[PDB]
Design a protein around this ligand. Structure first.
Ligand SMILES: Cc1cc2nc3c(=O)[nH]c(=O)nc-3n(C[C@H](O)[C@H](O)[C@H](O)COP(=O)(O)OP(=O)(O)OC[C@H]3O[C@@H](n4cnc5c(N)ncnc54)[C@H](O)[C@@H]3O)c2cc1C
Length: 454
């Protein structure tokens, strides 16, 4: 199946690998590129798994994995149809090369010194240029680690097609599902499950340690506004909640909180962050970043002379913003594409800043860029939403911008229901100016109000 030598070898079959393959092929039109993917599926995008796939009213959505965007346009979760790819076997013999995906195969050893790697079935493959695009694995909760296998079996860690399938089936079978975690993924799943639950009259609970949803990223006002919005989707939200233990009590899961509260439920979804997939650093003799996690790479995403790293697993040097590790779709696309350019001699640093988005249904959306963290100083500027200011229409307060500052300069921006303005946010961050008045900068985002106390 696997050829013995491949020029370009990409480890992991996700978003960063797909983008690098595309980039390599655009820059070297006869290039021969092999993606080694431990999953059985060809490369696909994750965002719809917590969003549009749940809003489909086609009962075969779980089989088709096609969805409608908020504006009604239908598409596949897969980046390309299967016919786009060439077989791994044909890859050395096909005139003008191509991209092949070896599915169901895991790279288990990296022998950097010999430009060679080993698969789980013992096959060995040599390369000229290699990209590590291994992503991450969801973290669990130590309280759940400590509980039995019975609790573990009724806890979902949500990241793939198989998890969407299993959880979707669970939502049709049980009466109560509890999401643990207040981040964007937990909050997206809450709204998705809350929507499903209204048709059946069942319950969705969300609990997290912070005062409100996305508390680690959004300042207080907007975090609180968001918690109230999730509640309006028919979710019972429980802020200020730290899990002490989880057990089974009379068939039910019983979550005990540190404050003495107890929550009975049928199933748990644990959305408490990602562990970057760095097992290959050991055999590879590659450095892991002890501050941010992931493989430590430079401004050009390079680890060693013929090894790059992109996507969720790459801790990189941002010449403007400092060392970072980002776990976002567009970042996987941007960093995968850049690695591909650098693998074909571009020698370019990360410059173009990647973006983030989240939707809580067709009516509420966030976009963000740069360094966004609720511990940084912030300035928020808000206004009443017009008709156009929701994810669907783009494709008392209801919208606004939040500037995140360091050394008096904007280093991150969150846009709340403001669409088609990311280029402006990216420019503000790039220019690094000390703004005399951020209410005047907010006018760049079509927010036009008198100054308000804060
Ligand atoms: C449900 C969900 C919803 C999301 N929604 C949003 C959103 O709305 N907006 C946003 O900005 N971001 C979102 N994200 C984040 C985004 O999807 C990720 O940042 C992106 O998938 C990262 O791409 P990646 O290629 O780095 O890793 P992945 O897409 O994780 O791909 C890595 C692949 O490599 C495989 N692999 C790992 N190790 C090996 C090995 N040793 N050998 C072979 N294969 C291996 C993994 O199994 C996996 O298949 C979401 C993520 C999830 C899970």
């Amino acid at each position: 199946k696997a050829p013995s030598h491949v020029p370009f070898l990409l480890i992991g079959g996700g978003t960063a690998a797909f983008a690098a393959a595309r980039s390599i092929r655009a820059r070297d039109p006869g290039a021969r590129v092999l993606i080694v993917s431990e999953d059985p599926e060809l490369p696909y995008m994750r965002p719809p798994l917590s969003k549009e796939l749940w809003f489909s009213d086609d009962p075969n959505v779980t089989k088709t994995l096609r969805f409608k965007q908020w504006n009604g346009k239908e598409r596949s979760i897969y980046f390309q149809p299967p016919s786009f790819y060439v077989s791994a076997q044909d890859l050395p013999h096909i005139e003008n090369g191509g991209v092949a995906v070896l599915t169901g195969k895991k790279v288990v050893q990296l022998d950097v010194r010999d430009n060679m790697l080993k698969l789980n079935d013992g096959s060995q493959i040599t390369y000229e240029k290699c990209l590590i695009a291994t992503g991450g694995t969801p973290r669990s909760l130590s309280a759940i680690d400590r509980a039995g296998a019975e609790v573990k079996s009724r806890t979902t860690l949500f990241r793939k097609i198989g998890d969407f399938r299993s959880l979707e089936k669970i939502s049709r079978e049980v009466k109560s599902i509890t999401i643990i975690g207040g981040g964007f993924l937990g909050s997206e799943l809450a709204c998705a499950l809350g929507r499903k639950a209204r048709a059946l009259g069942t319950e969705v609970i969300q609990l997290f340690p912070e005062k409100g949803n996305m508390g680690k990223i959004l300042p207080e006002y907007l975090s609180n506004w968001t918690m109230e919005k999730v509640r309006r989707e028919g979710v019972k939200v429980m802020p200020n909640a730290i899990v002490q233990s989880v057990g089974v009590s009379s068939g039910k899961l019983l979550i005990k909180l540190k404050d003495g509260r107890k929550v009975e439920t049928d199933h748990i979804v644990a959305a408490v962050g990602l562990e970057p997939n760095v097992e290959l650093a050991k055999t590879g003799g590659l450095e892991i970043d002890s501050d941010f996690g992931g493989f430590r790479v430079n401004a050009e995403l390079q680890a060693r002379s013929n090894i790059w790293v992109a996507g969720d697993a790459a801790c990189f040097y941002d010449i403007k913003l400092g060392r970072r590790r980002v776990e976002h779709h567009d970042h996987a696309v941007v960093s995968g594409r850049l690695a591909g350019e650098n693998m074909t001699g571009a020698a370019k640093p990360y410059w173009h800043q990647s973006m983030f988005w989240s939707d809580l249904g067709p009516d509420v959306g966030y976009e963000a860029i740069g360094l966004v963290d609720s511990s940084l100083p912030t300035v928020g500027v808000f206004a009443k939403a017009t008709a156009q200011d929701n994810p669907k229409s783009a494709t008392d307060y209801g919208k606004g911008v939040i500037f995140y500052l360091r050394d008096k300069v904007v280093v991150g921006i969150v846009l709340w229901n403001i669409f088609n303005r990311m280029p402006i946010a990216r420019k503000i961050i790039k220019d690094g100016e000390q703004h005399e008045d951020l209410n005047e900068v907010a006018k760049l985002f079509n927010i036009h109000e008198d100054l308000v106390p804060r």
